[PDB]
Write a protein that binds this ligand. Structure first.
Ligand SMILES: C[C@@]1(O)[C@H](O)[C@@H](CO)O[C@H]1n1ccc2c(N)ncnc21
Ligand SMILES: C[C@@]1(O)[C@H](O)[C@@H](CO)O[C@H]1n1ccc2c(N)ncnc21
Length: 377
C-alpha cells in the first residue's frame, strides 16, 4: 500500500507523497502546503489546523499547540516546567507525565501529548487519502535528532492512534539531506541550519557511502519566526499608543488582526525593502497604517538573529570541527529566507555560501516522502 511522508513540526506539519516518480507536497483544505499543529476544543466541536489556530484569540485555554515540546517528557523536566509557564492551556501531572486538560461541552477532558499529535497526523493522513483516492495506513515521520527513545516511541504511539503504522522514524537533518539530494557517495560533512516558526536546531550530519550520521546537534527551543513577528508587534503597539492613545493589547481581536498583517509584512521583507501594514478599523473608528522597512525589521531582531550562531559554535566545538571542515551548509525552515540570516551564516563561515533550496519550509516533509519512496523501492 502507499507510504506518505510527514513532517510533524512544533508549529506546523507538512505531508508529501511520492507518486509517478515525483514528490507532491499536498495542500490543506485552504490551499496551504503547511498546516498549524493546533487543535481546538470549543463549544462541543473539535477543529484541527488553521481553523483551530483562529480559536486561540478568543479561547486560549481550549486551543492546544506546541505539544511536540511535551511529547515523551516528564512533568518535572526543567523544559516542561518552563513550557507550562508559557502555554495557556492547562498541563497536569498524570503519573509523572504531562497531560493536556481542556473542556468538551464543559466536561474536564485530559489528553496525552500523543493523543493531540494523533489528531494532527489524522488530518495529514486524510489530505493524502483524498489526494491519492486510497486508504493510507503507513508513513515515514520525522523527529529532531535530539529526540530520546521515549520521545520517538510517543511519536510512534501518536501514529498508531491516528491509524498509521510509522514504518520509519527519521531525524530532521537526514530528511533535509534527502530533500536537497546531497551526494551519498564518499564522505561529506553538512551543517543543517533549521530555523522554524518556534524553534531553532543546528546539526552536523556526516554522509559516508550512503550512511547518514548526526555527529552533533544543538539549538534553542524558544527562537523562531514567531519571535521575529513579536519584536515587530511590540514596536508597532508602542508607536500606535504614542500616536493615538490606544494600547492595542487592551483588544485581543485588534492584536490578532495586526499579527496577521505583521507576518505577511515580514515575508514580504525577505524580497522587498519596504512594505505597508494596513488594518481598517483595527478598533472602531481607528485605522492602522504603517511602513516597515527591511532595515527596521533587522534592527528589531538583530540580537535574535545573532543568537542562532551560539548553537553553531557549540556543534562545531562538540564535533571538534574547524569551520572549513563543513563541505555544505543547507538551510531548512521558511525563516532561513530572511536575507540577514543568510548573511550572518556566510560571514560566520568566512564567506562560504549556504545552500538555500527554493522551498526550505517543505524540505523536511519532502525528505520524509523521498524516504517513503526509498523504502518501497
Ligand atoms: C511562516 C514563517 O513566518 C514561520 O515563522 C516559519 C515556519 O517555518 O517560516 C516563516 N517564513 C516562511 C516564509 C518566510 C519568508 N518569506 N520570510 C520570512 N519568514 C518566512
Ligand atoms: C495622541 C495625541 O493626542 C497626543 O497626546 C497629542 C500631542 O502630541 O497629539 C496627538 N498625537 C501625537 C502624535 C500624533 C500623530 N502621529 N498623529 C496623530 N495624533 C498624534
Amino acid at each position: 500500500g502507499p507510504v506518505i511522508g510527514i513532517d510533524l513540526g512544533t508549529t506546523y506539519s507538512c505531508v508529501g507523497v511520492f507518486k509517478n516518480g515525483r514528490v507532491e507536497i499536498l495542500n490543506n483544505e485552504l490551499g496551504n502546503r503547511i498546516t498549524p499543529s493546533y487543535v481546538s476544543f470549543v463549544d462541543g466541536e473539535r477543529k484541527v489546523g488553521e481553523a483551530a489556530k483562529l480559536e486561540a484569540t478568543l479561547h486560549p485555554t481550549q486551543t492546544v499547540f506546541d505539544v511536540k515540546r511535551l511529547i515523551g517528557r516528564k512533568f518535572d523536566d526543567q523544559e516542561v516546567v518552563k513550557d507550562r509557564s508559557l502555554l495557556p492551556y492547562e498541563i497536569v501531572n498524570n503519573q509523572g507525565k504531562p497531560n493536556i486538560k481542556v473542556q468538551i461541552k464543559d466536561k474536564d477532558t485530559t489528553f496525552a501529548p500523543e493523543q493531540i499529535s494523533a489528531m494532527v497526523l489524522e488530518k495529514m493522513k486524510e489530505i493524502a487519502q483524498s489526494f491519492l483516492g486510497k486508504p493510507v495506513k503507513n508513513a515515514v515521520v520525522t523527529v529532531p535528532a535530539y529526540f530520546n527513545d521515549a520521545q520517538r516511541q510517543a511519536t510512534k504511539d501518536a501514529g498508531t492512534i491516528a491509524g498509521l503504522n510509522i514504518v520509519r522514524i527519521i531525524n530532521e537533518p537526514t530528511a533535509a539531506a534527502l530533500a536537497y539530494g546531497l551526494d551519498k557517495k564518499e564522505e561529506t560533512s553538512i551543517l543543517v541550519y533549521d530555523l522554524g516558526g518556534g524553534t531553532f536546531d543546528v546539526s552536523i550530519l556526516v554522509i559516508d557511502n550512503g550512511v547518514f550520521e548526526v555527529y552533533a546537534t544543538a539549538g534553542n527551543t524558544h527562537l523562531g519566526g514567531e519571535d521575529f513577528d513579536q519584536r515587530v508587534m511590540d514596536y508597532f503597539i508602542k508607536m500606535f499608543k504614542k500616536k493615538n492613545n490606544i494600547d492595542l493589547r487592551t483588544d485581543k481581536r485588534a492584536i490578532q488582526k495586526l499579527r496577521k498583517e505583521v507576518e505577511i509584512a515580514k515575508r514580504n521583507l525577505s524580497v522587498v525593502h519596504s512594505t505597508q501594514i494596513e488594518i481598517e478599523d483595527i478598533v472602531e473608528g481607528h485605522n492602522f497604517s504603517e511602513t516597515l522597512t527591511r532595515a527596521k525589521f533587522e534592527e528589531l531582531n538583530d540580537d535574535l538573529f545573532r543568537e542562532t550562531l551560539e548553537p553553531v559554535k557549540k556543534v562545531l566545538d562538540d564535533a571538534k570541527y574547524e569551520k572549513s571542515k563543513i563541505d555544505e551548509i543547507v538551510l531548512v525552515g521558511g525563516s532561513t529566507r530572511i536575507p540577514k540570516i543568510q548573511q550572518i551564516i556566510k560571514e560566520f563561515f568566512n564567506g562560504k555560501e549556504p545552500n538555500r533550496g527554493i522551498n526550505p519550509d517543505e524540505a523536511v516533509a519532502y525528505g520524509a516522502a523521498i524516504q517513503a519512496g526509498i523504502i518501497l523501492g
